[PDB]
């Protein structure tokens, strides 16, 4: 019943930079709110409490501020392990609610991947159908498309490109554009390859 | 000094499911604890909070006429119970202390993937300065993989879940290794998944 | 606003207890005594044991006789977002048909739906629609008529005009 | 015995508004607020706002009645954070050689709460109205300066949770402490 909304919705920025985020509440707050950080999978950690004080076990590069409803969170200097999603914490009154959930990124200097390809399995093929993979590790940015040219044919079909979260110290991504096909359709051809974005275009591979 | 929780899993719609939490080794005379919710790959949603003598129950929207908080200051055991359940709640549940105006003590939580379906066991398939990996298929969440039982921590970069066409989850995890190590050591992924009771 | 809720002002140490104090007037005590009510939730309320006191440092009132008290209630939890004689009564079965008092007639200029000026009303002259033998000329006479219900139709008559 | 109200009298205007009224002693009504409950069938709701007008007091109200039949009529009757009054502190007086004042407070289980202490020392031949009023943001000891080497002086302290999100009244003063030379 209390509208809590944080802005911006997303903010990428290089290392050693000044950063800012803001909470906006529908009603008054006086000073009852807090600031949470959340790395994916792991549990949320308390970043800043009482809207202007840092919790024990947290560096002083972070800074909280605000009163009434126009609140803030500024970071005076950024490090590569500061990659996470940030959330607001109501406290003035019930029902207690949170911010929309802001997520930041890191302006990493452009990195190139060392591409790989791996085969299916005989037990897998024996069970029924089969799958073929393709990934790009230690790279940046995520903006990179893929094209599987099996027998020079665009596999405008069954793809499945999942992506990981950025590294702690490395600050680099890793994507997995997987493909798949039946045991009969797999022997329907012999050549199997892929494409890459950002020389610039690159491929990899028939049996 | 870290509280933990248990209970909850895959279940068809409508059916109930108990949630059992537990504090641990604090000086707790005597603070309050809330439940909060994490929807899969989504924002954070609040749910409830009892108090001391089971005095004030608080819910929110859907939860009203569904879930029920309960106090247990006896042996330090905040429990939760919900009867009617649908895929609005297909989420994981975090237990969290409420130190005055903010939370501080947090739990790992548990997934409560409401849905009417079973779980066929996966079939781990391998993948052959080089690399090597481990793939799976037909993964109810979650599934956890361990490369060489916690030995390979450096150079490893796993991937998150990915639902298929039909379709169930198909995770993936990979590792780097030089051509020099091609035949020197046994790189194998030991996998674990509670709902499929595999190992 | 009544005096108990006007004199009551609860403060606390925010850790162990809550110390409330209020007052009731001596004039009411002879009539009926009052007790402080503390609610636990929507369905269940709970009483609290209280006692008298000699002073009253938190609230005030321009009354002559007051009975200040000191109620202490304990607690093992405190957070920002926290907010907190004998049976009397009377009933009556009132049908709206028999308890009907129609409106006062407005501007003889008179689902749904008399006496002289000097003379008194003590025994004035009596009086179906809203419209010499009654008065001697050169003598004023006030107009006093109201709208009452027909007996062959219950309640009471209108206000006088 | 009979502080109860009498003459519960009601009448319908003959349109869509019933109106009722009752008398009650001015002494009993000063301690208890009352309201008129009505039941359009044998829901229960109350009228508002009710009017009021020597020893007795007449209250009247006009209830909208859009229709119904037999009616059931009757007459029937704090934030913790912003209301804090901490307990008084335990005050002692010490002098190294120089005089240093010391006091203690009840442990707040939320230790992070900043404590605002107001202190004052007095010359026995003066008023507290005009006395040194030093402030302190959190502490449990204060060093005093030098003074007249033969005069008698008093000392007093009070605490407040003068925070931001919080509020409330100050704590009662401590039992005054005295010294000389
Ligand atoms: C009301 O309480 C006071 C104090 O207990 C008592 O003196 C007085 O007689 C009581 N009144 C009645 C009507 O019982
Ligand atoms: C009302 O007055 C009319 C004449 O104007 C008369 O015929 C009728 O009987 C009167 N009715 C009553 C009830 O007096």
């Amino acid at each position: 019943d209390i509208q809590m909304t944080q802005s911006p919705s997303s903010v990428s920025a290089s290392v050693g930079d000044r950063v800012t985020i803001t909470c906006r509440a529908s009603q008054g707050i006086s000073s009852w709110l807090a600031w949470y950080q959340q790395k994916p999978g792991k549990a949320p950690k308390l970043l800043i409490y009482a809207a202007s004080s840092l919790q024990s076990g947290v560096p002083s590069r972070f800074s909280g501020s605000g009163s009434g409803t126009d609140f803030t969170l500024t970071i005076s200097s950024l490090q590569p392990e500061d990659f996470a999603t940030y959330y607001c914490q109501q406290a003035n009154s019930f029902p207690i609610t949170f911010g929309q959930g802001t997520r930041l990124e890191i302006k990493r200097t452009v990195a190139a991947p060392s591409v790989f390809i791996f085969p299916p399995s005989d037990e897998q093929l024996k069970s029924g159908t089969a799958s073929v993979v393709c990934l790009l590790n230690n790279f940046y940015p995520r903006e990179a498309k893929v094209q599987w040219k099996v027998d020079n044919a665009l596999q405008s079909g069954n793809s499945q490109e999942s992506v990981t979260e950025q590294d702690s110290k490395d600050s680099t991504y890793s994507l997995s554009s997987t493909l798949t096909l039946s045991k009969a359709d797999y022997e329907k051809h012999k050549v199997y390859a892929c494409e890459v974005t950002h020389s610039s275009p690159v491929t990899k591979s028939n049996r | 000094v870290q509280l933990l929780e248990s209970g909850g899993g895959l279940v068809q719609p409508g059916g109930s499911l108990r949630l059992s939490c537990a504090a641990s080794g604090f000086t707790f005379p005597w603070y309050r604890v809330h439940w909060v919710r994490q929807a899969p790959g989504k924002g954070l949603e609040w749910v409830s909070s009892i108090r001391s003598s089971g005095g004030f129950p608080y819910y929110n929207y859907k939860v009203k006429g569904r879930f029920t908080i309960s106090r247990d200051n006896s042996k330090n055991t905040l429990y939760l119970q919900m009867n009617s359940l649908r895929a609005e709640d297909t989420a994981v549940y975090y237990c969290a202390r409420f130190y005055d105006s903010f939370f501080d003590i947090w739990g790992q939580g548990t997934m409560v993937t409401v849905s009417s379906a079973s779980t066929k066991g996966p079939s781990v398939f391998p993948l052959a300065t080089a690399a090597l990996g481990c793939l799976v298929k037909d993964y109810p969440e979650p599934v956890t993989v361990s490369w060489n039982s916690g030995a390979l921590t450096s150079g490893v970069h796993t991937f998150p879940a990915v639902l298929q066409s039909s379709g169930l989850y198909s995770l993936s995890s990979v590792v780097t290794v030089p051509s020099s190590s091609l035949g020197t050591k046994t790189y194998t992924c030991n996998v674990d998944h509670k709902p499929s009771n595999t190992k | 606003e009544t005096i108990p809720l006007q004199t009551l002002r609860c403060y606390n140490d925010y850790t162990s207890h809550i110390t409330c104090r209020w007052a009731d007037t001596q004039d009411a005590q002879r009539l009926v005594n009052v007790t402080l009510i503390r609610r636990v939730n929507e369905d269940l309320l709970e009483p609290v044991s209280c006692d008298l006191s000699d002073d009253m440092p938190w609230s005030a009132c321009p009354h002559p006789r007051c009975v200040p008290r000191r109620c202490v209630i304990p607690c093992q939890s405190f957070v920002v977002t926290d907010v907190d004689d004998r049976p009397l009564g009377t009933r009556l079965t009132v049908t709206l048909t028999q308890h009907v008092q129609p409106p006062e007639p407005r501007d003889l200029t008179w689902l749904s739906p008399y006496k002289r000026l000097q003379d008194s009303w003590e025994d004035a002259a009596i009086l179906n629609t809203s419209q010499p033998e009654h008065l001697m000329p050169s003598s004023t006479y006030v107009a006093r008529v109201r709208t009452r219900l027909a007996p062959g139709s219950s309640g009471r008559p209108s206000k006088w005009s | 015995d009979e502080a109860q109200p009498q003459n519960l009298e009601c009448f319908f205007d003959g349109a869509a508004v019933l109106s009722c009224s009752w008398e009650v002693r001015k002494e009993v009504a000063s301690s208890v607020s009352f309201g008129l409950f009505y039941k359009p069938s044998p829901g229960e709701e109350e009228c508002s706002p009710v009017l009021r007008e020597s020893l007795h007091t007449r209250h009247h109200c006009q209830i909208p009645v859009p229709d119904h039949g037999q009616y059931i009529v009757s007459v029937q009757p704090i934030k913790s954070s912003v209301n804090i009054q901490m307990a008084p502190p335990s005050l002692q007086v010490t002098k190294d050689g120089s005089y240093s004042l010391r006091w203690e407070t009840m442990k707040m289980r939320y230790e992070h709460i900043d404590h605002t202490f107001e202190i004052q020392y007095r010359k026995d031949t003066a008023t507290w109205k005009d006395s040194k009023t030093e402030t302190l943001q959190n502490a449990h000891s204060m060093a005093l300066p030098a003074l007249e080497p033969s005069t008698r002086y008093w000392a007093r302290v009070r605490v407040r949770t003068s925070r931001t999100g919080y509020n409330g009244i100050w704590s009662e003063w401590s039992e005054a402490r005295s010294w000389d030379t």
Side-chain angles (χ1 to χ4, degrees), chain A residues 1-2 4-38 40-41 43-44 46 48-53 55-102 104 106 108-122 124-125 127-130 132-137 139-142 144-146 148 151 153-155 157-158 162-164 166-168 171-174 176 178-180 182 184 186-187 189 191-194 196-198 200-203 205, chain B residues 3 5 7-9 11 13-15 20-31 33-49 51-63 65 69 73-74 76-78 80-81 83-104 106-107 109-110 112-119 121-122 126 128 130-131 133-134 136 140-151 153-156 158-161 163 167 169 172-176 178-184 186-192 195-198, chain C residues 2-4 6-23 25-26 28 33 35-36 40-44 47-51 53-62 64 66-89 95 97-99 101-103 105 107 112-113 121 123-125 128-129 132-133 135 137 143-146 150-153 155 157-158 160-161, chain D residues 1-7 10 12-25 28-35 38 40-43 46-50 54-57 61 63-67 69-71 75-77 80-84 86-91 93-95 97 101-105 107-113 115 117 119-120 122 124-126 128 130-136 138-143 145-152 154-159 161 164-166 168 170 173-174 176 178-181:
Chain A
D1 293 30
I2 308 299
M4 179 60 65
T5 53
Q6 56 188 134
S7 163
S9 303
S10 295
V11 180
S12 59
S14 64
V15 191
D17 299 24
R18 180 173 296 280
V19 187
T20 66
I21 286 184
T22 62
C23 284
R24 276 290 176 183
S26 40
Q27 290 72 31
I29 298 294
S30 81
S31 285
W32 293 132
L33 59 75
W35 273 117
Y36 286 75
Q37 173 177 308
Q38 189 194 20
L46 169 53
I48 272 170
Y49 79 94
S52 192
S53 57
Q55 181 57 37
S56 297
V58 181
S60 60
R61 72 200 180 198
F62 279 43
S63 278
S65 282
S67 62
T69 179
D70 49 318
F71 292 78
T72 88
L73 191 183
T74 190
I75 302 170
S76 57
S77 183
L78 191 64
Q79 315 305 329
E81 289 212 338
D82 299 28
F83 179 84
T85 54
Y86 294 64
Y87 292 79
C88 304
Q89 167 65 49
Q90 167 70 327
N92 179 269
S93 181
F94 284 101
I96 202 139
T97 49
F98 305 77
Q100 60 162 217
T102 298
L104 64 78
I106 294 172
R108 162 62 202 267
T109 179
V110 186
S114 300
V115 62
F116 284 84
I117 287 181
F118 310 80
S121 174
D122 289 29
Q124 175 179 133
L125 205 149
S127 179
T129 62
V132 185
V133 304
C134 173
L135 81 96
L136 307 88
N137 190 275
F139 81 92
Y140 188 90
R142 181 172 56 186
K145 199 170 175 65
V146 63
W148 285 54
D151 205 331
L154 173 56
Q155 284 294 331
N158 298 25
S162 65
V163 190
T164 195
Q166 209 178 152
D167 187 278
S168 304
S171 64
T172 59
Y173 296 120
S174 79
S176 172
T178 307
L179 224 80
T180 170
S182 61
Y186 176 51
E187 300 284 19
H189 314 295
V191 190
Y192 293 104
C194 66
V196 175
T197 303
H198 91 278
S200 272
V202 189
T203 69
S205 301
Chain B
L3 75 96
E5 45 284 332
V11 60
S20 179
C21 178
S24 55
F26 304 106
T27 51
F28 45 90
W30 207 96
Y31 303 136
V33 176
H34 302 3
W35 299 91
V36 300
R37 202 173 57 179
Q38 173 68 102
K42 292 161 179 294
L44 203 157
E45 296 156 13
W46 198 79
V47 51
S48 177
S49 61
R51 210 72 173 287
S52 299
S53 183
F56 293 100
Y58 297 97
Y59 309 145
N60 201 350
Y61 300 125
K62 149 68 193 188
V63 184
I69 202 70
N73 47 327
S74 64
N76 322 132
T77 305
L78 176 59
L80 188 146
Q81 181 165 321
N83 173 238
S84 64
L85 291 171
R86 292 200 175 283
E88 296 179 274
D89 308 321
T90 168
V92 316
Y93 286 66
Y94 287 61
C95 172
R97 188 249 293 285
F98 194 51
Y99 186 88
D100 190 31
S101 93
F102 56 93
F103 308 68
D104 195 23
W106 281 87
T110 310
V112 190
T113 61
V114 53
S115 277
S116 181
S118 186
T119 163
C134 190
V136 292
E141 291 278 281
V143 288
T144 176
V145 59
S146 74
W147 273 114
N148 203 332
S149 182
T153 182
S154 181
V156 53
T158 180
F159 285 82
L163 194 135
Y169 288 103
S172 304
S173 186
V174 293
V175 200
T176 185
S179 301
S180 54
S181 64
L182 177 52
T184 196
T186 56
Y187 301 99
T188 309
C189 53
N190 281 314
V191 62
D192 302 87
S196 54
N197 75 264
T198 59
Chain C
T2 67
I3 54 96
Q6 177 177 332
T7 53
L8 183 145
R9 288 196 177 185
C10 298
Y11 293 69
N12 64 87
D13 190 29
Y14 197 75
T15 173
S16 58
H17 65 272
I18 314 171
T19 308
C20 301
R21 50 183 69 181
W22 52 285
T25 179
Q26 210 172 222
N33 333 129
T35 298
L36 181 63
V40 179
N41 53 25
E42 291 292 333
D43 297 330
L44 296 174
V48 286
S49 302
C50 301
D51 50 274
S53 181
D54 201 45
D55 212 324
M56 177 48 58
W58 287 347
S59 301
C61 160
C66 291
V67 186
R69 282 194 181 80
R70 285 175 69 172
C71 303
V72 175
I73 189 76
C75 261
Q76 50 272 26
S77 59
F78 278 98
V79 174
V80 165
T81 186
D82 281 276
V83 180
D84 305 317
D85 177 82
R86 287 168 72 182
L88 71 94
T95 179
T97 306
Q98 297 183 356
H99 297 60
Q101 186 171 306
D107 186 34
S112 341
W121 305 102
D123 188 26
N128 318 52
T129 59
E133 52 267 25
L135 293 169
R144 182 174 184 186
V145 184
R146 57 176 173 181
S153 182
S158 296
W160 286 109
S161 54
Chain D
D1 187 37
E2 278 295 340
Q4 304 175 44
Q6 306 82 5
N7 191 25
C10 306
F12 183 60
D13 74 331
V17 178
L18 179 141
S19 186
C20 181
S21 179
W22 71 100
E23 301 180 10
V24 68
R25 292 189 177 281
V28 66
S30 69
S31 180
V32 186
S33 278
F34 276 98
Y38 57 89
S41 198
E46 279 196 341
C47 183
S48 55
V50 63
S54 55
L55 281 67
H56 81 326
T57 46
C61 196
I63 304 167
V65 172
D67 218 326
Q70 280 73 348
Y71 272 63
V75 277
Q76 299 294 349
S80 303
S81 57
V82 293
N83 286 337
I84 281 176
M86 299 178 74
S90 307
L91 174 55
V93 191
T94 307
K95 50 160 71 162
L101 263 152
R102 305 214 169 79
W103 60 102
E104 274 202 342
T105 311
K107 166 60 180 303
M108 296 248 59
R109 49 179 44 165
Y110 300 146
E111 75 300 340
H112 72 277
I113 298 167
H115 293 172
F117 289 115
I119 62 99
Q120 54 175 356
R122 187 192 130 207
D124 190 31
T125 322
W128 296 99
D130 185 84
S131 183
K132 282 158 49 266
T133 166
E134 208 166 329
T135 51
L136 281 186
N138 182 261
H140 320 88
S141 65
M142 175 272 185
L147 207 113
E148 201 283 334
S150 298
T151 193
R152 188 165 207 73
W154 292 93
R156 248 162 59 182
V157 58
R158 53 171 179 164
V159 67
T161 182
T164 64
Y166 299 116
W170 290 70
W173 287 97
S174 64
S178 201
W179 42 272
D180 39 280
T181 179

